[PDB]
Amino acid sequence: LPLYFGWFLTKKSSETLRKAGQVFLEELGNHKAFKKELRQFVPEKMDLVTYFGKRPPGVLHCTTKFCDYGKAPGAEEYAQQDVLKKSYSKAFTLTISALFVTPKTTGARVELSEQQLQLWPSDVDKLSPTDNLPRGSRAHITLGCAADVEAVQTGLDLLEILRQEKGGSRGEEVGELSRGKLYSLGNGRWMLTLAKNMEVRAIFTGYYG
């Protein structure tokens, strides 16, 4: 079994989203709202492209099931599904509706279709036992991580953002960047909601390390 399954972006789609991410970081770091919050981000204008120093080098992806070569619970069962066999090596179009920044990670929020959710595993959309976020809420594409941060944190950061909003504490609109509206979520967290959702082409496959 692979390390994980997921949707792996084409070269062109990866480059498009990477560039969108970079422009977001560049503009956010120069935005007055961000500058006001600098000590809530890093306890001196900060170059966020540099801050998020660990980045995917080329092909970007949206993970479905972490398998750990069969050691992750449910990996084998997931791999054996007819729907996976029918989807393997097939091209999909994923919708990105927002970009986000926290002190740990930056990435893209993916909003999966009903069909794509057939490939989404159980028990990944919770931060606590009693959480009731929509199926697929964790779906994301990592665009960068702070130096001491593991890439898995990107999904956890998105879940935290979505939990905050579901709980009734939504972001404050503080302005407009390229591609959409900027929201301050507090505690170093920022979200760009895209005026036009970005569509990326990607192949469902397994990654072996």
From Swiss-Prot:
Binding, substrate: T63, T142
Entry's localization field: Membrane; Melanosome
Enzyme active site: H61 (proton acceptor), H140 (proton donor)
Modified residues (Phosphoserine): S169
Disease: Leukodystrophy, hypomyelinating, 20: An autosomal recessive disorder characterized by neuroregression and loss of motor, language and cognitive skills, after a normal early development. Disease onset is between 12 and 18 month of age. Patients show poor overall growth, microcephaly, feeding difficulties and spastic quadriplegia. Some patients may have seizures. Death in childhood may occur. Hypomyelinating leukodystrophy with subcortical and periventricular white matter abnormalities is seen on brain imaging.
UniProt family annotation: Belongs to the 2H phosphoesterase superfamily. CNPase family.
Quaternary assembly: Exists as monomers and homodimers.
Biological function: Catalyzes the formation of 2'-nucleotide products from 2',3'-cyclic substrates. May participate in RNA metabolism in the myelinating cell, CNP is the third most abundant protein in central nervous system myelin.
Protein name: 2',3'-cyclic-nucleotide 3'-phosphodiesterase
Organism lineage string: Eukaryota, Metazoa, Chordata, Craniata, Vertebrata
Residues of the full protein shown: 186 to 399 of 421
